[PDB]
């Protein structure tokens, strides 16, 4: 179960392999847009948080 | 122009980095791979243009 809208939680990552594989979890997503980033290419990026 | 000048448009991903002085006339949709695109699609399979 989430969390609500007025009180979203966040969870911070900064020691772990950022992949990103979100094909295998519903993967028919109703709105899936990117913004600055490349869909395919933010694989293959690093970051800081 | 407000809400407009449609005529003028751009590429924000190719499948391959264009040569030097290479001109591309068709607008294809990039192929995802890890599913199969025909017409619409999710994750690698947008609109170029």
Same mark, same amino acid.
């Given at each position: 179960?989430?969390?609500?809208?007025?009180?979203?939680?966040?969870?911070?990552?900064?020691?772990?392999?950022?992949? +990103?594989? *979100?094909?295998?979890?519903?993967?028919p997503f109703?709105? =899936?847009?990117? +913004?600055? *980033?490349?869909?395919?290419?933010?694989?293959?990026?690093? =970051?800081?948080? | 122009?407000?809400?407009?000048?449609?005529?003028?448009?751009?590429?924000?991903?190719?499948?391959?980095?264009?040569?030097?002085?290479?001109?591309?006339?068709?607008?294809?949709?990039?192929?995802?791979?890890?599913?199969?695109?025909?017409?619409?699609?999710?994750?690698?399979?947008?609109?170029?243009?």
């Amino acid at each position: 179960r989430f969390a609500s809208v007025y009180a979203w939680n966040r969870k911070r990552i900064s020691n772990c392999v950022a992949d +990103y594989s *979100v094909l295998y979890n519903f993967a028919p997503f109703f709105a =899936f847009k990117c +913004y600055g *980033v490349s869909p395919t290419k933010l694989n293959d990026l690093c =970051f800081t948080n | 122009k407000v809400g407009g000048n449609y005529n003028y448009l751009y590429r924000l991903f190719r499948k391959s980095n264009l040569k030097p002085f290479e001109r591309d006339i068709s607008t294809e949709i990039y192929q995802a791979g890890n599913k199969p695109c025909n017409g619409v699609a999710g994750f690698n399979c947008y609109f170029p243009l």
